[PDB]
Amino acid sequence: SGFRKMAFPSGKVEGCMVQVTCGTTTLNGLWLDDVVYCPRHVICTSEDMLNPNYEDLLIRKSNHNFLVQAGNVQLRVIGHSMQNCVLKLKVDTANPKTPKYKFVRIQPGQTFSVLACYNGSPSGVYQCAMRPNFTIKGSFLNGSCGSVGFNIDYDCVSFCYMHHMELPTGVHAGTDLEGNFYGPFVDRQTAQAAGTDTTITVNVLAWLYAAVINGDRWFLNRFTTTLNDFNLVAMKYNYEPLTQDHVDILGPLSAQTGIAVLDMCASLKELLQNGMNGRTILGSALLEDEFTPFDVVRQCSGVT
Amino acid sequence: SGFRKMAFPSGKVEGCMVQVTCGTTTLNGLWLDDVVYCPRHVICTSEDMLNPNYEDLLIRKSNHNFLVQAGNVQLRVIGHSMQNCVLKLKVDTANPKTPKYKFVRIQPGQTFSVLACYNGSPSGVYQCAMRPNFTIKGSFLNGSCGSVGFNIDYDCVSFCYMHHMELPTGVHAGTDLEGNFYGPFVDRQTAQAAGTDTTITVNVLAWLYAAVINGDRWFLNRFTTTLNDFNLVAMKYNYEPLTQDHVDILGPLSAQTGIAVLDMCASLKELLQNGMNGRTILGSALLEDEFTPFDVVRQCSGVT
Ligand SMILES: NC[C@]1(C(=O)Nc2cncc3ccccc23)CCOc2ccc(Cl)cc21
Numbered sequence: 001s002g003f004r005k006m007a008f009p010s011g012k013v014e015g016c017m018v019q020v021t022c023g024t025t026t027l028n029g030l031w032l033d034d035v036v037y038c039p040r041h042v043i044c045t046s047e048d049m050l051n052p053n054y055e056d057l058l059i060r061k062s063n064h065n066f067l068v069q070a071g072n073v074q075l076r077v078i079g080h081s082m083q084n085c086v087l088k089l090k091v092d093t094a095n096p097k098t099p100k101y102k103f104v105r106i107q108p109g110q111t112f113s114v115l116a117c118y119n120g121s122p123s124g125v126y127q128c129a130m131r132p133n134f135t136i137k138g139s140f141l142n143g144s145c146g147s148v149g150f151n152i153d154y155d156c157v158s159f160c161y162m163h164h165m166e167l168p169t170g171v172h173a174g175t176d177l178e179g180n181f182y183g184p185f186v187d188r189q190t191a192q193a194a195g196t197d198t199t200i201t202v203n204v205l206a207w208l209y210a211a212v213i214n215g216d217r218w219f220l221n222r223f224t225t226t227l228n229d230f231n232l233v234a235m236k237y238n239y240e241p242l243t244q245d246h247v248d249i250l251g252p253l254s255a256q257t258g259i260a261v262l263d264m265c266a267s268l269k270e271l272l273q274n275g276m277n278g279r280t281i282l283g284s285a286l287l288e289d290e291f292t293p294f295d296v297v298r299q300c301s302g303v304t
Numbered sequence: 305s306g307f308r309k310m311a312f313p314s315g316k317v318e319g320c321m322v323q324v325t326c327g328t329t330t331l332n333g334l335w336l337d338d339v340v341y342c343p344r345h346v347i348c349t350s351e352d353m354l355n356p357n358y359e360d361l362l363i364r365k366s367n368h369n370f371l372v373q374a375g376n377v378q379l380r381v382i383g384h385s386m387q388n389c390v391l392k393l394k395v396d397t398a399n400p401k402t403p404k405y406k407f408v409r410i411q412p413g414q415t416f417s418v419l420a421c422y423n424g425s426p427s428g429v430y431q432c433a434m435r436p437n438f439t440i441k442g443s444f445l446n447g448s449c450g451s452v453g454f455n456i457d458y459d460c461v462s463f464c465y466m467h468h469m470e471l472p473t474g475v476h477a478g479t480d481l482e483g484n485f486y487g488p489f490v491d492r493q494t495a496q497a498a499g500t501d502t503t504i505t506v507n508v509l510a511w512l513y514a515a516v517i518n519g520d521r522w523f524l525n526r527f528t529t530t531l532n533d534f535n536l537v538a539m540k541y542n543y544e545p546l547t548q549d550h551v552d553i554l555g556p557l558s559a560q561t562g563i564a565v566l567d568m569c570a571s572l573k574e575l576l577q578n579g580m581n582g583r584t585i586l587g588s589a590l591l592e593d594e595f596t597p598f599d600v601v602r603q604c605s606g607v608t
């Protein structure tokens with residue numbers, strides 16, 4: 001019993017973190033095999049960030065201008081290239097701690113763990129989600145760039161995020177491990193405002209199923225609804241539309257609890273319309289949307 | 305910017321987890337040097353849990369009855385002893401991944417990370433706190449016993465908790481690494497009810513300081529108070545009394561924000577009396593109490 005915002009064990013990722021310095025700029029890099037991946041803005045000064053021409057700034061950089069340190073030992077850079085918004089620094093030594101890994105580009109609503117790092121050293125691990133507006137609500141200070149987001153399937157780490165930027169609103173933007181930003185964000189210190197941060201409906205429903213599995217059942221109502229009627233309410237509350245694909249994904253949670261997906265939608269509809277009335281669900285006074293249906297099944301089943 | 309419920313990187317602890325089996329009972333153990341620590345209830349059947357006489361049950365167990373597996377390799381048990389509610393299984397091999405470590409007994413209100421494990425394998429990491437009633441609100445399923453709670457000071461892991469039990473209310477009880485339970489709980493399947501789960505006032509105040517540092521300032525009021533007046537309100541709301549020691553501990557957060565501790569107390573007093581009015585603080589609709597003042601300084605400063 002109990003339900004926590006749980007991150008994946010971070011050991012496999014801690015073994016990959018290195019410090020990357022270019023001139024007077026330092027950030028984190030991810031060392032997998034003989035390649036260190038890091039944000040390309042490691043080549044920028046604070047002034048360059050205002051309007052950087054990365055290809056031009058990179059002409060002034062050679063392999064020896066990128067200092068890669070793993071622990072307290074220096075790695076030898078034998079090649080470098082820019083792929084979208086990341087640099088790939090080829091080193092002469094394969095990371096002996098390289099786990100089984102994949103690079104994946106996640107969809108909005110998908111969750112992942114972040115290992116926040118400073119100077120190549122891990123400081124903490126937390127769970128977050130790719131928001132529907134393609135920002136993430138992380139916890140990052142200056143120097144955290146290059147920290148990564150990931151999921152683990154038994155022994156394989158699927159890297160899905162690399163931290164690059166903080167918007168003026170305190171939310172975060174980054175790329176997948178091929179250097180493509182999530183959403184419309186750019187690695188330039190310019191006016192970039194995020195769109196509506198809508199609530200991830202399928203994740204709220206999954207967390208309401210977790211609440212029923214853990215004994216919090218007060219919100220279960222006597223009603224049902226349809227996807228169309230539910231979505232009319234979801235639109236009004238800035239919740240993402242629920243599709244039949246989301247209903248299919250919630251199937252196993254529906255079977256475990258015996259609560260039909262549309263009945264849970266009707267319970268969610270009443271919670272949106274009536275509020276919580278000072279009550280809590282799994283220790284929260286708001287509807288939590290950063291647990292996917294897969295996360296709920298994993299946490300409630302004990303997948304290692 | 306941003307403020308997350310952040311756990312310590314779990315790698316150093318993942319390297320210590322092993323599976324311990326005694327007969328048909330399996331749980332997790334912690335392998336440090338040449339000793340594996342685990343809950344003594346690994347010797348019990350489901351029936352024994354109702355009224356176990358551990359000393360008597362242990363007479364029927366020899367070193368070869370405790371199966372310790374690290375990964376997919378078996379460790380040789382050369383000694384065993386019971387210390388309070390834990391068994392210490394001496395093995396012939398020192399854990400090569402033993403980090404620098406200490407065993408500490410924490411006070412209520414103190415936070416720590418938990419590495420939830422099943423069959424000696426890590427499944428997730430989350431942050432929690434020792435409640436004022438000496439329970440913890442974890443996320444544990446059957447088989448999670450022996451999972452540990454810890455804090456990290458740079459390279460030294462201070463182990464503070466080992467999971468043993470779930471109360472009928474879904475909250476958790478466990479011991480320090482010397483086998484002494486936190487609070488009045490026992491490793492027996494009997495009527496054990498938790499006391500009042502009061503709110504950890506000093507931690508709420510620390511989290512209100514984190515909110516001000518991160519830009520959430522709406523709740524800052526035009527008032528101040530005294531410890532005595534504040535505590536009259538705290539008592540009414542089942543909040544722990546605030547002492548001058550808590551005020552001293554909040555000193556650095558007071559200096560960083562320029563908000564006197566008693567002014568923040570007055571703001572907290574108004575939030576308790578008026579409610580949130582549908583507003584949020586750091587993405588929460590309730591007052592968060594599982595961040596200590598040290599956690600806030602660490603997260604807002606970037607300690608690795
Ligand atoms: N140091 C490089 C960089 C960075 O780390 N950004 C940040 C990323 N995340 C959280 C931050 C929290 C406070 C401060 C900066 C943060 C990225 C490139 O553009 C900039 C531009 C300005 C500044 Cl002051 C920093 C940066």
Ligand SMILES: NC[C@]1(C(=O)Nc2cncc3ccccc23)CCOc2ccc(Cl)cc21
Nearest residue numbers: 001345353444445446447449468469470493
């Ligand atoms: N298997 C041993 C043990 C255990 O793991 N307990 C649990 C601890 N934490 C979370 C649990 C969530 C569901 C179930 C049990 C949980 C501890 C000893 O006493 C008992 C007694 C009964 C049962 Cl059914 C299990 C146990």
